[PDB]
């Protein structure tokens, strides 16, 4: 049906070549057409390199397609709506899962879509606002970001947050046409102090780079096999310690113990696509599987940098009752490895939740 | 200062935003060496090459004349650690300078030399990559130009031996299409 289809045409009248594959909206502008000033940009710009001449002959811009954004938004709306009962720590898990589901997949294309950045910001504000509703307050002085962004090891919610970033804004009149650039920024979300929050996107490696890395890592790997052959000495761990976690197949996945069995598995990637029909729940990770493709991201840094930005262990804990427990240190804090756990979450932040300074309130003395 | 830089950079999408965030803060200028030293270290130390951290170092140069200088210095500062750094992070660097030098933030090279005399097998790989990246952009012809007007010596000479080391070494890299004239010179 012409209605569902789409067509683009490249001719001396039309420089740009548009198309849509999978979730990606792609544009392609050659340098042989009018590219005017040649320039780099954020990794949202791919360079298409002639295989023959090793030259950059054109540029592909990525943009996150509409229907995708729509799906994510319905996924957040699924988290809000489908949970009226569920615990607040549970929702934050739902958010984190969906959010990495978007970010690991799209990565570069996210930064070139302003509509996404907006949607993420408002949606973070909606789930945090909902957790606020969960207790009874909307009062900001009662929910400083330290409670949401503390990795729950220290008793926070461990919320992954992409939405404190500034949102570029310039010239709607011209920006609807000529791609003017950035003359302004809008504040995404509040910060109690000047402060900071780290963004997911900064800790994920872009798709372009992981591709080039993949090619190089594999070629070098074959070299490591050849040198091992000529030496007759088999290869150890150390000569592979360099590339250990790198490459799209994630080279370490060769060394999986069960590797045999997986060698006889085929078409896994399509079965994942059709699991949505066999199983009721909605898989965001449908595109890949860690067993064939490895783990394509490591967020371990994000936690450390998160704790640093909040002022260190002493920074986050300064919002808690910890000094009440009279524990000598927090180095030994160990947690309990429609009932209390919610109710407990309040005590732990109770110095922050309840404040002598608030916007509006009637100060009440508990009974005795 | 060193911690604020990291947090501002880890926070921001795009490379544009971190500079705005960083400039905005109006941290003291002289430090405009170490800061940039921060960016070069902070990502290069960071696990794999990412386009962002390399762009940032460069813009930070065009905005103030000194920032450019601050970088070229920091490239010098490498000589001491050309051997010392472990053999991953060279994979981030070689390219990572590749992207400042393809886009013009070349002759600063010349300081770098090819000798069995003193080159670190580290440094060997470092420079090796640097060309196998920068080539992949300019495509080995524009590179033919840039060299031919470069007057890079410690790289390109005397020392017919070192002309075997040079030219051979660029058969090893594999490009070796800018080694011609030197081949003639051997003869």
């Amino acid at each position: 049906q012409w209605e569902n289809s789409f067509v683009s045409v490249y001719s001396k009248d039309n420089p740009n070549l548009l198309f849509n594959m999978c979730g990606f909206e792609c544009r392609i502008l050659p340098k042989c057409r009018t590219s005017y000033e040649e320039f780099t940009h954020k990794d949202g710009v791919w360079n298409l390199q002639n295989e023959v001449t090793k030259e950059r002959t054109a540029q592909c811009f990525l943009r996150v397609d509409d229907e995708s954004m729509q799906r994510f938004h319905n996924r957040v709306r699924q988290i809000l709506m489908a949970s009226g009962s569920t615990t607040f720590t549970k929702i934050v898990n739902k958010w984190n899962t969906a959010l990495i589901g978007l970010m690991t997949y799209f990565r570069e294309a996210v930064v070139n879509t302003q509509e996404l950045l907006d949607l993420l910001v408002k949606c973070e504000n909606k789930i945090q606002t909902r957790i606020k509703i969960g207790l009874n307050s909307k009062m900001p002085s009662r929910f400083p970001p330290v409670v949401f962004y503390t990795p729950k090891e220290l008793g926070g919610l461990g919320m992954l947050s992409m939405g404190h970033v500034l949102i570029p804004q310039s010239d709607l009149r011209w920006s609807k046409q000529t791609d003017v650039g950035i003359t302004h920024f809008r504040s995404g979300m509040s910060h109690e102090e000047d402060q900071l929050i780290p963004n997911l996107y900064r800790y994920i490696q872009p798709w372009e780079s992981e591709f080039i890395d993949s090619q190089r890592v594999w070629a070098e790997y074959a070299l490591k096999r050849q040198e091992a052959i000529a030496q007759n000495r088999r290869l150890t761990l150390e000569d592979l310690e360099d590339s250990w976690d790198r490459g799209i197949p994630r080279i370490n996945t060769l060394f999986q113990k069960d590797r045999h069995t997986l060698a006889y598995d085929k078409g896994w990637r399509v079965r994942t696509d059709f699991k949505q029909y066999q199983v009721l729940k909605q898989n965001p990770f449908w595109w890949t599987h860690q067993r064939h493709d490895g783990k394509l991201w490591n967020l371990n840094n994000y936690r450390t940098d998160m704790i640093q930005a909040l002022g260190g262990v002493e920074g986050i804990l300064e919002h808690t009752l910890f000094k009440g427990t009279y524990f000598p240190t927090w180095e030994g804090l160990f947690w309990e490895k429609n009932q209390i756990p919610n109710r407990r979450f309040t005590l732990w932040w109770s110095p922050t939740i309840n404040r002598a300074n608030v916007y509006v309130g009637f100060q009440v003395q508990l009974d005795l | 200062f060193r911690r604020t830089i990291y947090l501002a950079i880890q926070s921001s999408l795009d490379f544009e935003e971190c500079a705005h965030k960083l400039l905005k803060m109006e941290f003291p200028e002289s430090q405009t060496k170490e800061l940039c030293n921060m960016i070069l270290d902070c990502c290069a130390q960071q696990r794999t090459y990412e386009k962002f951290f390399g762009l940032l170092a460069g813009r930070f140069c065009m905005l103030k004349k000194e920032y450019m200088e601050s970088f070229e210095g920091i490239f010098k500062e490498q000589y001491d650690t050309i051997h010392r750094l472990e053999t991953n992070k060279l994979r981030n660097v070689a390219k990572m300078f590749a992207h400042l030098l393809y886009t013009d933030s070349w002759s600063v090279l010349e300081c770098i030399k090819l000798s069995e005399e003193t080159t670190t097998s580290s440094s060997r790989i470092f420079v090796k990559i640097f060309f196998q990246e920068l080539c992949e952009y300019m495509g080995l012809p524009k590179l033919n130009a840039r060299l031919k007007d470069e007057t890079l010596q410690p790289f390109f000479e005397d020392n017919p031996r070192n002309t075997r080391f040079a030219i051979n070494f660029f058969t090893s890299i594999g490009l070796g299409g800018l080694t011609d004239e030197l081949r003639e010179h051997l003869k």
Binding site: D118, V121, K122, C123, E124, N125, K126, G163, I167, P168, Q169, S170, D171, L172, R173, I182, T183, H184, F185, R186, S187, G188, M189, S190 | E16, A19, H20, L23, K24, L63
Partner: peptide, 26 residues
């Protein structure tokens, strides 16, 4: 001067609507 920038009104936006100008432009 709201120069066509910023939200019509920071009502549903999740933000405080604050627009400062790009401190690093050129």
């Amino acid at each position: 001067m709201y120069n066509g920038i910023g939200l019509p009104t920071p009502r549903g936006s999740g933000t405080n609507g604050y627009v400062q100008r790009n401190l690093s432009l050129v």
